[PDB]
């Protein structure tokens, strides 16, 4: 089955609009940024706001948010289902509901 979190190229505002209607904290999606070619962003619902994280890439081609690195978006997402996306707030990724 394809992943329910890959939304492709959707504007940041649309992502917020959609995530705001979600009922659970941690509801998220990965989108292709309009800020730069071939870049990804992670948008997550938390409380009454939507937080955005820029998916960084290093020289070897690994993805990362802070320090830990991943060989794919799939691994990054799966990791953050059990480990908080932030050290300051407890945010665990969970699939959106349709």
């Amino acid at each position: 089955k394809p992943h329910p979190w890959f939304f492709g190229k959707i504007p940041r505002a649309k992502a917020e609009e959609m995530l705001s209607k979600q009922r659970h904290d941690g509801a998220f999606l990965i989108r292709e940024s309009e800020s730069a070619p071939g870049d990804f962003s992670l948008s997550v619902k938390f409380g009454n706001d939507v937080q955005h994280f820029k998916v960084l890439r290093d020289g070897a081609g690994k993805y990362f948010l802070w320090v830990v690195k991943f060989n794919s978006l799939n691994e990054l997402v799966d990791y953050h289902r059990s480990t908080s996306v932030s050290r300051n707030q407890q945010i665990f990724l969970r699939d959106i509901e349709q």
Binding site: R12, S35, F53, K54, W66
Partner: peptide
């Protein structure tokens, strides 16, 4: 657009 990790 603000990013938490930036």
């Amino acid at each position: 657009x603000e990013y938490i990790n930036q």
